[PDB]
Design a protein around this ligand. Structure first.
Ligand SMILES: CN(C)C(=O)CCN(C(=O)[C@@H]1CCCN1C(=O)[C@@H](NC(=O)c1cc2cc(C(F)(F)P(=O)(O)O)ccc2s1)C(C)(C)C)c1ccc(-c2nccs2)cc1
Length: 558
């Protein structure tokens, strides 16, 4: 276990102990108050006995009167001392409650403002291919203890308040309790609202009329008996503007930007795991309301209303999903992805709904592109420092081959996916995404195997192959054709020594695969640097299969 995590567990055990201590004190204080009340009635009976001396022999009366006086004077003195003891125990209990609430405040800030935020950030980067955020198991186990400890303390101070109503003692206790109560309502509000979270986000590139899912959960749901009357959670699609004003409490009526089919779900309690979660499995976007379409951000607002405890402590919880870009056609998916990638990667913590920086530094963009690239190609072979130099030369229209020279250069959103690259009809994102699309669709094994060098220009291709045996070739990414793969090969000749074949695209690869095509060209012998062609591609050569129409009753490879 981590050291930061062990300290959290140490504090939970410390908080449990001090809450037991105030429970014991409150039981002692209830006994003192009850005994004091019996003794107060004993003082009224001394008075009643004095009135019963009216019918007594004044010789015997003298004895029974001095005795009643000695009893009254001592019981009166005891009662007065006991009254200050009751006030002192009530102050020492309020001080103890104030002390544990401050330790609980520090503990809750760690759980909610750091550990939960880290998990949410991990879930946010996972949308770009980052490593999975992991189970909410730990955050739930911690939030359960926050709920259990704040509740135990609230019911202790409700019991203390009953005692004060039963026997009021004016003084500093009344304002110490008024303060402890304010601290409790803040802790409970922050805990309830902050633990209503999306476990499984909806798709960030969302086509209308397409089934989609999301999972919301209340981390403290089982501990505060919210599972008793499981609340209905409703999902609505809202705009970036509607989200901004929603958080500033300017929601006019019930603002929304479209309709979600099957947008209602009742939370389900799972006794074994203690989890209270709404699983929306069949949501669908029926319509969307507009104001680029691929730059327009929406969010799925999940809201619910429930109360904590037998009585009415009602909470209205709201949680916004990570921004979503709504497409209708499917061809819009590529540009929508850039808007999502920029948001997921560069959102500053604590931002107002969907504010992103205009510019980032080249190494920040590199981290985002490499994370996306490996998720798309499904490989651990990502963008090397050389590949980054190639993309930096392309993006900045620079000649440097030193990655360090690009360190302090900034890429704006328009430089990434608005303005086209010099002398081209496409943006840097459209070029990079075109490479990912061609690799993902047909060449995942080839990319993983090292068979596609790709991120080299014509001059780099020339200088790598110049001193290689004839038939040495590399597969490169085409500049002129988005999603294109061109063969560069060396073969000594009078005109040129290096040659670039016409690039292939997914349409060509659907008719005949890259491996089948390379296998047909007998003049391609070595895959750069010196790997025999069949060694790298033979695994993927289509074995010619005979057909049923040609008279073959059993499958046959002809
Ligand atoms: C059939 N067979 C046995 C063969 O050997 C035929 C091979 N073949 C050829 O000869 C073809 C036939 C016509 C001339 N051809 C050429 O390739 C000639 N070259 C070129 O035409 C070009 C090279 C490049 C490179 C690029 C780039 F590198 F990608 P970029 O980064 O600037 O974008 C861009 C444009 C061109 S045009 C040449 C001879 C080699 C000079 C072959 C190549 C590709 C295709 C395609 N089919 C489906 C799509 S592309 C079919 C024919």
């Amino acid at each position: 276990m981590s050291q930061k995590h062990l300290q959290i567990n140490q504090t939970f055990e410390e908080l449990r102990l001090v809450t037991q201590d105030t429970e014991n004190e409150l039981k002692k204080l209830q006994q003192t108050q009850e005994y004091f009340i019996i003794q107060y009635q004993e003082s009224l009976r001394i008075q009643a006995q004095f009135a019963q001396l009216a019918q007594l022999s004044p010789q015997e009366r003298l004895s029974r009167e001095t005795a009643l006086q000695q009893k009254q004077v001592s019981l009166e003195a005891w009662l007065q001392r006991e009254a200050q003891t009751l006030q002192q125990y009530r102050v020492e209990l309020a001080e103890k409650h104030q002390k544990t609430l401050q330790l609980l405040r520090k503990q809750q800030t760690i759980i909610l403002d750091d550990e939960l935020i880290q998990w949410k950030r991990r879930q946010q980067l996972a949308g770009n291919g980052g490593p999975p955020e992991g189970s909410l198991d730990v955050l739930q186990s911690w939030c359960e203890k926050l709920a259990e400890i704040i509740w135990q303390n609230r019911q202790q101070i409700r019991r203390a308040e009953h005692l004060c109503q039963q026997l009021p003692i004016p003084g500093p206790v009344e304002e110490m309790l008024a303060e402890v109560n304010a601290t409790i309502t803040d802790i409970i509000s922050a805990l309830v609202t902050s633990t209503f979270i999306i476990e499984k986000q909806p798709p960030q590139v969302l086509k209308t009329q397409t089934k989609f899912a999301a999972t919301v959960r209340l981390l403290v749901g089982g501990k505060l008996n919210v599972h008793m009357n499981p609340p209905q959670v409703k999902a609505t699609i809202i705009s970036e503007q509607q989200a901004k004003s929603l958080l500033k409490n300017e929601n006019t009526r019930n603002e929304c930007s479209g309709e979600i089919l099957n947008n209602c779900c009742v939370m389900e309690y799972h006794q074994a795991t203690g989890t209270l979660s709404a699983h929306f499995r069949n949501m669908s976007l029926k319509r969307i309301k507009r104001a680029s379409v691929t730059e327009e951000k929406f969010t799925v607002l999940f809201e619910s209303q429930f109360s904590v405890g037998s009585n009415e402590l009602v909470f209205q919880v709201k949680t916004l999903s990570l921004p979503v870009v709504v497409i209708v056609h499917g061809s819009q998916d590529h540009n929508a992805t850039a808007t999502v990638l920029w948001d997921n990667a560069f959102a500053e913590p604590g931002r107002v709904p969907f504010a992103v920086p205009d510019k980032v530094l080249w190494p920040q963009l590199c981290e985002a592109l490499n994370m996306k690239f490996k998720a798309e190609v499904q490989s651990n072979r990502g963008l090397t420092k050389e590949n980054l130099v190639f993309l930096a030369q392309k993006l900045f229209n620079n000649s440097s081959s030193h990655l360090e020279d690009y360190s302090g250069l900034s890429v704006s959103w328009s430089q990434f996916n608005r303005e086209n690259l010099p002398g081209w009809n496409y943006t840097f994102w459209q070029w990079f995404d075109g490479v990912m699309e061609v690799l993902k669709k047909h060449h995942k094994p080839h990319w993983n195997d090292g068979a596609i060098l790709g991120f080299v220009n014509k001059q780099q291709a020339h200088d790598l192959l110049i001193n290689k045996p004839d038939g040495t070739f590399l597969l490169r990414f085409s500049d002129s054709e988005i999603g294109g793969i061109t063969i560069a090969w060396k073969f000594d000749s009078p005109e040129r020594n290096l040659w670039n074949l016409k690039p292939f695209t997914t349409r060509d690869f659907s008719i005949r695969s890259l491996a089948d095509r390379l296998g047909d060209l007998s003049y391609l012998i070595y895959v750069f640097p010196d790997r025999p062609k069949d060694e790298v591609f033979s695994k993927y050569y289509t074995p010619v299969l005979a057909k049923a129409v040609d008279g073959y009753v059993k499958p046959q490879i002809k």
